[PDB]
Amino acid sequence: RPPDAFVNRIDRNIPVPARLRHTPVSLIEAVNDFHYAMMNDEERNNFYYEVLKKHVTPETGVLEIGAGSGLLSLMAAKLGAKWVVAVEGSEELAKLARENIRANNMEHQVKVLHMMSTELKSKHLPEPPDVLLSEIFGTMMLGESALDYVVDVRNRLLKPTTKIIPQFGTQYAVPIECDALHRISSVSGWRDLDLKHMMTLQDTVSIVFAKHYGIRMNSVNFRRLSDPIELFRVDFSSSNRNDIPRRKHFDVVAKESGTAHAMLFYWKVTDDEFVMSTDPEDTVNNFPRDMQWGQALQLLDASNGPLPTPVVFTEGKNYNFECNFSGDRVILHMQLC
Amino acid sequence: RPPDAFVNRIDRNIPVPARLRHTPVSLIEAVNDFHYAMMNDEERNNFYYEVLKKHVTPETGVLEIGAGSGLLSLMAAKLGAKWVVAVEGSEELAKLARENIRANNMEHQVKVLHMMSTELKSKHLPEPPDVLLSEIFGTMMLGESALDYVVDVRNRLLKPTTKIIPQFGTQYAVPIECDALHRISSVSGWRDLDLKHMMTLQDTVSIVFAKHYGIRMNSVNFRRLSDPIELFRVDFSSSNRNDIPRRKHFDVVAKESGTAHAMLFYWKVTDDEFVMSTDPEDTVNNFPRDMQWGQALQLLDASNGPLPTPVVFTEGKNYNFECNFSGDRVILHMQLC
Numbered sequence: 001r002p003p004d005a006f007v008n009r010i011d012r013n014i015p016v017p018a019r020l021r022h023t024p025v026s027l028i029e030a031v032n033d034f035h036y037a038m039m040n041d042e043e044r045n046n047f048y049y050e051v052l053k054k055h056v057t058p059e060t061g062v063l064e065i066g067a068g069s070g071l072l073s074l075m076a077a078k079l080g081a082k083w084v085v086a087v088e089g090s091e092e093l094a095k096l097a098r099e100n101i102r103a104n105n106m107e108h109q110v111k112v113l114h115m116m117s118t119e120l121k122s123k124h125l126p127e128p129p130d131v132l133l134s135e136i137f138g139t140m141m142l143g144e145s146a147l148d149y150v151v152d153v154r155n156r157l158l159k160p161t162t163k164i165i166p167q168f169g170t171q172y173a174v175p176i177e178c179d180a181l182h183r184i185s186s187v188s189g190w191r192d193l194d195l196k197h198m199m200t201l202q203d204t205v206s207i208v209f210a211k212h213y214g215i216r217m218n219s220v221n222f223r224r225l226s227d228p229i230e231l232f233r234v235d236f237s238s239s240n241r242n243d244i245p246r247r248k249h250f251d252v253v254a255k256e257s258g259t260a261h262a263m264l265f266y267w268k269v270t271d272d273e274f275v276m277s278t279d280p281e282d283t284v285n286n287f288p289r290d291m292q293w294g295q296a297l298q299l300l301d302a303s304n305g306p307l308p309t310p311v312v313f314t315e316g317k318n319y320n321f322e323c324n325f326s327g328d329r330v331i332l333h334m335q336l337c
Numbered sequence: 338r339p340p341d342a343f344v345n346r347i348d349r350n351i352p353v354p355a356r357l358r359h360t361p362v363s364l365i366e367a368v369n370d371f372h373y374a375m376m377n378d379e380e381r382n383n384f385y386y387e388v389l390k391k392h393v394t395p396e397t398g399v400l401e402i403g404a405g406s407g408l409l410s411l412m413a414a415k416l417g418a419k420w421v422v423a424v425e426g427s428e429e430l431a432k433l434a435r436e437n438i439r440a441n442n443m444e445h446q447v448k449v450l451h452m453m454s455t456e457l458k459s460k461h462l463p464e465p466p467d468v469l470l471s472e473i474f475g476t477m478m479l480g481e482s483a484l485d486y487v488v489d490v491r492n493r494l495l496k497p498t499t500k501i502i503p504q505f506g507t508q509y510a511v512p513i514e515c516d517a518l519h520r521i522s523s524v525s526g527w528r529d530l531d532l533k534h535m536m537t538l539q540d541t542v543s544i545v546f547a548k549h550y551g552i553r554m555n556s557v558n559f560r561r562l563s564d565p566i567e568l569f570r571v572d573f574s575s576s577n578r579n580d581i582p583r584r585k586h587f588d589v590v591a592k593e594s595g596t597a598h599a600m601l602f603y604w605k606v607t608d609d610e611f612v613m614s615t616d617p618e619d620t621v622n623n624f625p626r627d628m629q630w631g632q633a634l635q636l637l638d639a640s641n642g643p644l645p646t647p648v649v650f651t652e653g654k655n656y657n658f659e660c661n662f663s664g665d666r667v668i669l670h671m672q673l674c
C-alpha cells in the first residue's frame with residue numbers, strides 16, 4: 001500500500017473503484033492532467049512517427065529522454081528499431097510505460113529505465129544510440145529544459161552520426177490586443193466607485209499560460225499587432241545556452257493600431273519538412289494541442305510608474321522591446337523601452 | 338520588507354517595477370488570479386447592488402463576510418448604510434480593501450477587520466447588523482463553505498429581523514456528452530498500438546473545474562442529455578448541514594441518446610426577483626463569470642470494473658444516480674447505479 005494511495009485523501013463516504021484505490025495520487029494526476037491530452041494530439045504523434053520513419057532501421061539503436069506513457073518509444077519499436085531504451089524520471093510513469101509495452105508485446109524491444117537523463121551512463125545502453133528522441137517541450141518551448149537535457153546527453157552518450165529528433169526549435173512572441181484577456185486582468189471602477197488602486201498589483205512580469213487564465217486563444221477575439229518576433233532558434237544537435245543572449249533587443253513595427261495588452265508566446269519545432277507548431281493559427285482544429293501545450297502570455301506595462309501604463313501601438317511606428325532571460329534561458333520577459 | 342516579497346522569486350536579470358517589488362506574492366496571486374475577474378463580472382456586481390438597494394437605509398447596519406477588494410461593502414456605504422463592517426481572513430486583502438475605501442473617501446463608513454468570520458464577536462460590531470452580506474460562493478456553490486460560515490454568524494451575531502443577502506442557493510447537475518472533454522480525458526490507442534491500459538487511471542471520482550481542463554463550456558460543443566438535476570437547495574436564513582442528506586438518489590430520464598461523459602455542475606443563487614446563475618446558458622455573454630466561477634465536471638464510470646465503462650443514455654430510459662456528500666456537504670460524487 002503506497003503512502004500516497006489515491007483513496008487516502010478521498011472522503012470515506014465517496015466511492016472509489018479498485019482500479020484507482022491504491023494507485024499513487026501523483027500518477028493519477030499526471031495522466032489525467034497531461035497524458036490523455038498529449039496522446040490525443042494526433043498531429044504531434046504523426047510528426048514523431050514520420051520523422052522516426054525517415055531514420056529508424058533494423059540496425060538503429062534508439063534512446064528516448066522521457067518515456068511517459070511509452071508511446072514514442074513504442075513507435076520506434078513498431079518501425080523496427082534494433083533496440084529502444086527510454087529513461088523516465090518518474091517511478092510510477094516508468095511502471096506505466098512498461099505496462100503499455102507489455103500490452104503491445106514489445107518487452108524484448110523496449111526497455112524503460114527509472115532515472116533522469118542526467119544520470120544515464122554509457123553502461124546503461126547496449127551501445128551509443130543512432131537516434132536520440134525526445135518530446136520534453138513545454139508551453140514555453142524550453143519550459144521543461146529541453147535544451148539542457150539534450151545537451152547533457154549529446155555531450156556524453158552519443159556518436160558523431162547520431163540523429164537527434166527533433167532537430168530545430170524556434171520560440172516566437174507577438175504583441176496582441178485581447179479584450180477578453182483585458183477584462184480578467186485589469187479593472188478601473190464600478191459606476192462612481194474608483195478601483196484603480198487594484199491596478200498597482202497587475203502582474204506584468206510573469207509568463208502565464210493561457211490555460212491558467214481559463215482562456216483558449218482560439219476561442220476569444222484577439223489581434224496580432226505586428227509580424228511575429230523570433231526570440232531565438234535552436235538546433236538541438238549543436239546549440240548551447242550561450243547561443244541565446246541573456247539580453248536581446250527587438251524592433252517591432254506596428255502593422256495595426258491598438259492596445260498591446262500582452263505578448264503572446266508560441267513556438268515551432270521542425271525536422272526536415274515536418275512541423276510541430278503551437279501558433280493558434282495552426283491549432284484551430286487541434287483542441288488537444290491547445291489543452292496540452294496551448295500558448296503563454298505576459299501582460300505589458302509601457303513604463304515603471306506607480307500604476308501600469310498601457311502599451312499603445314499606432315500602425316507604422318517602431319516599438320523597441322528588451323528581452324531578458326534567466327541563466328537557463330527558460331524564463332524570459334519582454335519590456336517596452 | 339516582507340519575507341515573501343514578489344521580487345524574491347523573480348530572476349535577478351528580469352525587471353520588476355517598484356509597485357510590485359515588495360508586495361507579498363500571495364496578494365499579487367490572489368488579485369491577478371481571482372479579483373480582476375470577479376470585479377469585471379458586471380451581472381454579479383449588479384445583482385448585489387440591486388438586492389442591497391432593496392434593504393439598505395441610513396438606519397441599516399451592514400456586516401459583510403469576506404471584504405476582498407471591498408467592492409460590495411463600498412456599495413452598501415454608497416447606498417447610505419448607517420455603518421459597514423467587513424471581515425477579511427487575509428491580512429493583505431484586508432489592507433487592500435482599506436486602500437480602496439480610502440480611495441473612495443469612505444473610511445468613516447466602512448471598517449475592515451482582519452479575521453475569519455468564525456472569530457467575530459458581538460463586541461467587534463456597533464450592534465447586531467440589520468443586513469448580513471456575503472459573496473463566498475465557489476465553482477461548486479458551497480465550495481468555499483458559504484453555508485457553514487453564514488450559519489456560524491447567523492447563530493451568534495444577528496437579530497430576528499436581519500436580512501441575509503443572498504437568501505437562496507440551488508446546486509444543479511446535468512449529464513453531458515462532450516467530445517472535446519472526452520478527447521482530453523480518455524485514450525484507446527494509436528494506430529495498431531493499444532493504449533487502453535491508460536484508462537485504468539481515468540479519474541471518475543474528483544470534481545474538476547472546467548477551467549482546470551483549460552476548457553470553457555460555452556466554447557465547446559456539448560449536449561445536455563436530461564433535464565437539470567436539483568442536487569439540493571438552501572435558504573441561507575434557515576438551512577443547516579442536515580437539510581442536505583449525506584446520500585441522495587436521483588431518477589434521471591434521458592431526453593437524448595448519447596454518451597454521458599461527465600456530470601456538469603452549475604448553480605443558481607437568488608434573492609427575490611434577482612438571479613445569479615453559473616449555468617453556461619446564462620453566461621454566454623459573461624466571460625468574466627465563466628473565468629471566475631465557470632462550471633465543474635465529474636467524469637462518469639458506469640460500473641466498477643478494471644476499466645471504466647461509458648455511461649450510455651438511450652432517449653426515454655430511466656437512469657438512477659447515487660449522490661454522496663462529505664460531512665461538510667462541500668464535496669459530492671454522482672454514481673450510476
Ligand SMILES: Nc1ncnc2c1ncn2[C@@H]1O[C@H](CSCC[C@H](N)C(=O)O)[C@@H](O)[C@H]1O
Nearest residue numbers: 066067068071072087088089116117135149
Ligand atoms: N531529463 C529527463 N529524464 C527522464 N525523464 C524525463 C526528463 N524530463 C522529463 N521527463 C519525463 O518525460 C516525460 C515527458 S511527457 C512524455 C512524452 C512521451 N514520450 C510521449 O511522447 O508521449 C514525462 O513523463 C516526464 O516525467
Ligand SMILES: Nc1ncnc2c1ncn2[C@@H]1O[C@H](CSCC[C@H](N)C(=O)O)[C@@H](O)[C@H]1O
Nearest residue numbers: 403404405408409424425426453454472486
Ligand atoms: N469566513 C470568512 N471570513 C472572512 N473572510 C473570508 C471568509 N471566507 C472567505 N473570506 C475572504 O472573502 C473574500 C471572498 S472574494 C471577495 C468578495 C468581495 N466582497 C467582492 O464581492 O468583490 C476573499 O477575499 C477571502 O479571503
